[PDB]
Design a protein around this ligand. Structure first.
Ligand code: RET
Length: 137
């Protein structure tokens, strides 16, 4: 499949509960939820290589990886981690993360292209799954 596109968020669920697991205090959780309503994802896919730019109104970052090749990024709350992405099916990829220093909750993310043209992203911390849904601009 082709994940390439400028993706705009239409739905976001359980993001506050995810940040709670990660230790973010309540006021910052509420503002982070508000920031997620301007969450946009720009993807350029070339084969198994992905160039991803994620952004909100005041913050943007780039995540570049090749499936099956370890890279370094951060968890959603900003802890550095080592990451590895694998395919789970034709249209879905899964990323397992391991903290680079210290310990913490078990975190991961997934990306899936649906047959209706939506992009579904999930982020997981231990038992809590946050789900975000996007459509192409
Ligand atoms: C789609 C693949 C990856 C690795 C996406 C990572 C996304 C983030 C780290 C995004 C974090 C944000 C959220 C969820 C809400 C708005 C503010 C951020 C863009 C920092």
């Amino acid at each position: 499949p082709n994940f390439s596109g400028n993706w705009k968020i239409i739905r976001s669920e359980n993001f506050e509960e995810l940040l709670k697991v990660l230790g973010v205090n309540v006021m910052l959780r509420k503002i982070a939820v508000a920031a997620a309503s301007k969450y946009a994802v720009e993807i350029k896919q070339e084969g198994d290589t992905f160039y991803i730019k994620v952004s909100t109104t005041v913050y943007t970052t780039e995540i570049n990886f090749k499936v099956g090749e370890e890279f370094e990024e951060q968890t959603v709350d900003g802890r550095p981690c080592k990451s590895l992405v694998k395919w789970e099916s034709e249209n879905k990829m899964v990323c397992e993360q391991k903290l680079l220093k210290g310990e913490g909750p078990k975190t991961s993310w997934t990306k899936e292209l649906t047959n209706d043209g939506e992009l579904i992203e999930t982020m997981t911390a231990d038992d809590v799954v946050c789900t975000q849904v996007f459509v192409r601009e």
